[PDB]
Amino acid sequence: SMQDPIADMLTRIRNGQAANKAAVTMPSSKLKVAIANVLKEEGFIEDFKVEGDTKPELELTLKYFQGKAVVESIQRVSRPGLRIYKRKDELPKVMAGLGIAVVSTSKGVMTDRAARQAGLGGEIICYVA
Amino acid sequence: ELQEKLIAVNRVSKTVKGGRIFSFTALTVVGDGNGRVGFGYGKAREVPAAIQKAMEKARRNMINVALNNGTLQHPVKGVHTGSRVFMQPASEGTGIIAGGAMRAVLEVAGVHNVLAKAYGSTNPINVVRATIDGLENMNSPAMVAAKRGKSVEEIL
Amino acid sequence: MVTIRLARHGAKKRPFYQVVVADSRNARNGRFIERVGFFNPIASEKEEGTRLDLDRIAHWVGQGATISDRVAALIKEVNKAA
Amino acid sequence: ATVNQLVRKPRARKVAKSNVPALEACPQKRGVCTRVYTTTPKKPNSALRKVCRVRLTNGFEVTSYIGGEGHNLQEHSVILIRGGRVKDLPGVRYHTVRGALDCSGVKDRKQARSKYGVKRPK
Amino acid sequence: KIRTLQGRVVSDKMEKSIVVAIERFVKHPIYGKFIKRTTKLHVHDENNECGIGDVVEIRECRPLSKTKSWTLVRVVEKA
Amino acid sequence: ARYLGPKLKLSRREGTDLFLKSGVRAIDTKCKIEQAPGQHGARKPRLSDYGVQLREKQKVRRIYGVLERQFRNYYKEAARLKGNTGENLLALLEGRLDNVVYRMGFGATRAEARQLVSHKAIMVNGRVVNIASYQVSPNDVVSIREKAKKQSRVKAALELAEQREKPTWLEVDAGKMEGTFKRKPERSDLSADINEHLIVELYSK
RNA sequence: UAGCUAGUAGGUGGGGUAACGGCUCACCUAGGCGACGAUCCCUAGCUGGUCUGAGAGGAUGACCAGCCACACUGGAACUGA
RNA sequence: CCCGCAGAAGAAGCACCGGCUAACUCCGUGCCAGCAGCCGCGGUAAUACGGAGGGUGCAAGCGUUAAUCGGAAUUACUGGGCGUAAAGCGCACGCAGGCGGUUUGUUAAGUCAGAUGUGAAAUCCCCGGGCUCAACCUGGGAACUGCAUCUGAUACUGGCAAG
Ligand SMILES: [Mg+2]
Ligand SMILES: [Mg+2]
Ligand SMILES: [Mg+2]
Ligand SMILES: [Mg+2]
Ligand SMILES: [Mg+2]
Ligand SMILES: [Mg+2]
Ligand SMILES: [Mg+2]
Ligand SMILES: [Mg+2]
Ligand SMILES: [Mg+2]
Ligand SMILES: [Mg+2]
Ligand SMILES: [Mg+2]
Ligand SMILES: [Mg+2]
Ligand SMILES: [Mg+2]
Ligand SMILES: [Mg+2]
Ligand SMILES: [Mg+2]
Ligand SMILES: [Mg+2]
Ligand SMILES: [Mg+2]
Ligand SMILES: [Mg+2]
Ligand SMILES: [Mg+2]
Ligand SMILES: [Mg+2]
Ligand SMILES: [Mg+2]
Ligand SMILES: [Mg+2]
Ligand SMILES: [Mg+2]
Ligand SMILES: [Mg+2]
Ligand SMILES: [Mg+2]
Ligand SMILES: [Mg+2]
Ligand SMILES: [Mg+2]
Ligand SMILES: [Mg+2]
């Protein structure tokens, strides 16, 4: 069974980058769209496009810069088998602040730095480097 | 200006109809102290020759590393055959807290402040392989800015 | 009953007394309710040596705490000096 | 490996046995030489290594190497044994202490005297 | 405002008394997984105003029997 | 608690000059400074990393006259203190009272200085201090008392010191025989040949 | 070590306690605990702490201080705040 | 604690030196005697045994033994693996359990934020102070990662309701 859609999405992105695919599509969800927005804002992908009504498909346009993938690494962290929540003081710094960590806070899904500025922790969905 | 130092020299044998043929392998590592490091693995029937071969090899195919103020840019892992290595930037004045081979490559590279450990196998050749890979696979804030299409101030 | 007394701390030949309120039954250096000061009988010049938290002492006395002779002497000294 | 598995039954710490279990975490122990004899070493060595089967104060019957040249041992001789194996003899885990209860120091030793219970010459 | 706990009525046979599981969703000390732990409590309920499976709020009180030191305050979701 | 043996021997073993003699007569004339100590000195096996570190550590320890436990303690304190550990360690060593007197110039050698301190000839802030390990603090005046002021050794030492290079971090008056420890010396003021970093690594393995 | 428990689990009323209470007693109900390890077996005083360790941990509970239990072994109460 | 007296006077050992591991030569023995933490050494030239000289390391101590943690990512939560190295049940069905596509609403258990109370003193750490210095004592902080309660956020996970 599919047991983790966010994880699946991340993997899809990684494989697309590996195989140099221009875009990657998957069943859309609200959490997925939010994650995509965070990625776009932070600049790890070029674009996302949700398309359809009954079963809509999110389509991300991946980002390349010198023949190689912009998203160097991208791991899910809080996975279903083991949820991870951090307090604002325990929020991780990925790649010494270069990479980002998408964190689901009380005020919506946001990057780790933004969450820290706000002053709240939450479920750490994934790290991106 | 291209400071070089030999990590390990090891004698290896091949067997023939007659008896054993001994020979020496020299693992050297050179670097300019500003980022550039290159390792070389020479083999010859006697040690000095082996060392010379290693030095020549090392001198070519060196590799530049984006170093931040005499230390690493972020915590970096490195893997290879067995030698899996972890290395973390540390505050100025800590000095290089790093194993043997690892210490050599880092030192010639020009990193003055690191905390390293070699996990897994500690086979000098492999550990050097791991360390160089790890150092290379490390981008700077300039590079990340370039990749993501932002300014360095937006990233911090 | 609750009392206010010196508790011996320091080294051999160099006593330093912590003034503590404590139930008299308790051992000298044992269980105590509150530590309301200290007194250093070997304190040199250009050193304070004594400090009695007077408000706390007053409160405890009001509550009904008896006072050691030495502590009383110290209190008198603090009062005069201050 | 799965967190669920670990939660159900966590990881067992590897209970390491002692290589000197007759000492029973004592630094030395007294025993009586039941029998003192010589024995042949293990494979790449030739010798007649001196060893004594000792009844310990706590019941155990061990065998103990006797280092140094020459010794004043026999049956019913109370000695102290210490931790340490002779790699060389199979199954010997303990040394006698030279220079204690009923064991003399080695004769004419000028070095490592402390190891062999020998007093300082003058 | 008083301290009170909710729990499902696991049984109600012994008269004037119920047993109330109070599942708490604790985190594991080492592994970090969140495990459901349970705390059965013998609760006193006069009038036997409760069925099995019903969620019910209870408060702590002076001990009423060998094992029974909690009383219910209001029943909810009687199903 | 003290090394009681040949001094030029110590210097020979280290390689460098450790300054264990007054320097009236050159050490090359006083001993075979070129040849290493012992039956087998004229041999140089290639020294391991551990070995090299150890040799340097020995050098510094011999120079100051600190035994191992005390040295280790100094290192621990230095590490604990904020800033650079090696720099801190060197500062502590300099700070030592015997070292300070030697710098001022009342003792020809550090050994001489230590002896004076031991024998109660030196007052720090008008109090006869006896401990060689006594840490002198910044702005501390340290002076020879008058009974030792008559010492011909002390006056000889002063002359020798006048010959020697004066430290910037102290100020010493030869007639008064009193010096003010103005500040703990900086590493640039201390000798460059000492590689304190090796010591730090060795005590950090 | 997979079943354990009859004052056992709960109720009503008496008795008892400085105090609540199967604390005890008479009767009533047939319960209660248990794979989130009951019961049985082995070992063990507990904590602040100590040692170690980058940390997470591991080991440990001498001294000092808090709490508990015992006072030749096993029972019992009296006196008394 | 201070002052005076005399006179270098009363005061240095222990381990180690083949590699790991800082420090090497000669003699004696000849797989014997012996050594050893590991790897090993010794069968007639022993830098590995025993003695001597020399050296190295610690020093009023130095060695040996026991014991714990470390190194040991060698029980791997951080932080391991399972084709051939140890390791995929012979294969299925399936209760408890673990996990759960997508939308909306509600709740607020988890989660997060803030506050209040507590988390004894000693210890640890920081800046000070006192013992000639240190150990030691000591002032003030910090810390005590916790726990409880109350008030908020609805992102996520959970419950309930509808799709
Ligand atoms: Mg007085
Ligand atoms: Mg043989
Ligand atoms: Mg000493
Ligand atoms: Mg360390
Ligand atoms: Mg009743
Ligand atoms: Mg009644
Ligand atoms: Mg017991
Ligand atoms: Mg560790
Ligand atoms: Mg005792
Ligand atoms: Mg009795
Ligand atoms: Mg009575
Ligand atoms: Mg060597
Ligand atoms: Mg011989
Ligand atoms: Mg030996
Ligand atoms: Mg021979
Ligand atoms: Mg050897
Ligand atoms: Mg020998
Ligand atoms: Mg471990
Ligand atoms: Mg493995
Ligand atoms: Mg096989
Ligand atoms: Mg099989
Ligand atoms: Mg199969
Ligand atoms: Mg879901
Ligand atoms: Mg479910
Ligand atoms: Mg809540
Ligand atoms: Mg002071
Ligand atoms: Mg405290
Ligand atoms: Mg929901």
Side-chain angles (χ1 to χ4, degrees), chain E residues 8-37:
Chain E
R8 308 200 85 83
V9 174
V10 171
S11 161
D12 58 341
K13 302 183 208 309
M14 48 172 193
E15 148 195 304
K16 303 205 186 190
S17 302
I18 56 178
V19 157
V20 175
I22 294 170
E23 27 177 303
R24 65 209 242 76
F25 197 68
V26 79
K27 195 225 290 191
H28 207 97
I30 330 95
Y31 305 121
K33 182 170 173 64
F34 292 81
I35 50 181
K36 292 169 189 176
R37 305 301 40 161

Side-chain angles (χ1 to χ4, degrees), chain A residues 41 57 91 107 113:
Chain A
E41 92 197 22
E57 290 189 342
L91 290 174
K107 316 302 288 184
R113 84 170 65 79

Side-chain angles (χ1 to χ4, degrees), chain A residues 3 15-16 24 30 39 64-65 68 72 80 86 107 113:
Chain A
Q3 314 257 27
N15 300 357
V24 269
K30 49 170 183 275
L39 286 177
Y64 302 82
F65 186 71
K68 67 187 288 179
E72 346 178 0
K86 255 51 176 159
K107 316 302 288 184
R113 84 170 65 79

Side-chain angles (χ1 to χ4, degrees), chain F residues 60-131:
Chain F
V60 321
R61 273 185 44 202
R62 283 161 187 195
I63 276 157
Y64 296 84
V66 183
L67 298 206
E68 188 68 357
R69 275 210 169 285
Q70 192 154 78
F71 202 88
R72 182 181 336 286
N73 284 122
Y74 272 130
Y75 165 76
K76 282 167 152 70
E77 174 174 24
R80 198 194 53 71
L81 292 155
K82 297 270 88 176
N84 186 306
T85 53
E87 282 51 7
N88 278 354
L89 174 53
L90 278 176
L92 283 171
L93 278 176
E94 250 43 66
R96 287 170 65 87
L97 175 54
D98 62 341
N99 179 80
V100 169
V101 30
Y102 168 74
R103 253 61 221 69
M104 263 145 204
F106 310 127
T109 54
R110 286 188 223 277
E112 182 148 279
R114 202 220 188 78
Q115 159 113 138
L116 270 169
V117 167
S118 192
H119 292 212
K120 302 182 189 183
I122 305 191
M123 53 193 161
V124 180
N125 297 310
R127 296 165 70 76
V128 60
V129 182
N130 212 40
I131 296 312

Side-chain angles (χ1 to χ4, degrees), chain A residues 21-90:
Chain A
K21 307 214 82 63
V24 269
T25 198
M26 63 222 86
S28 190
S29 119
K30 49 170 183 275
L31 182 50
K32 275 187 204 163
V33 305
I35 282 159
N37 283 277
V38 162
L39 286 177
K40 193 179 173 55
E41 92 197 22
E42 294 308 278
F44 288 100
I45 62 183
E46 291 178 18
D47 198 53
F48 68 101
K49 202 180 206 295
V50 206
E51 290 308 319
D53 289 61
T54 169
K55 40 183 183 176
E57 290 189 342
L58 181 59
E59 176 180 47
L60 312 342
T61 301
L62 303 178
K63 197 176 290 177
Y64 302 82
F65 186 71
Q66 303 175 349
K68 67 187 288 179
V70 169
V71 46
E72 346 178 0
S73 159
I74 181 160
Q75 60 180 359
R76 144 86 92 170
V77 165
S78 184
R79 60 176 221 271
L82 182 44
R83 299 284 169 186
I84 301 298
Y85 315 93
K86 255 51 176 159
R87 321 234 320 285
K88 60 140 188 182
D89 299 309
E90 307 180 342

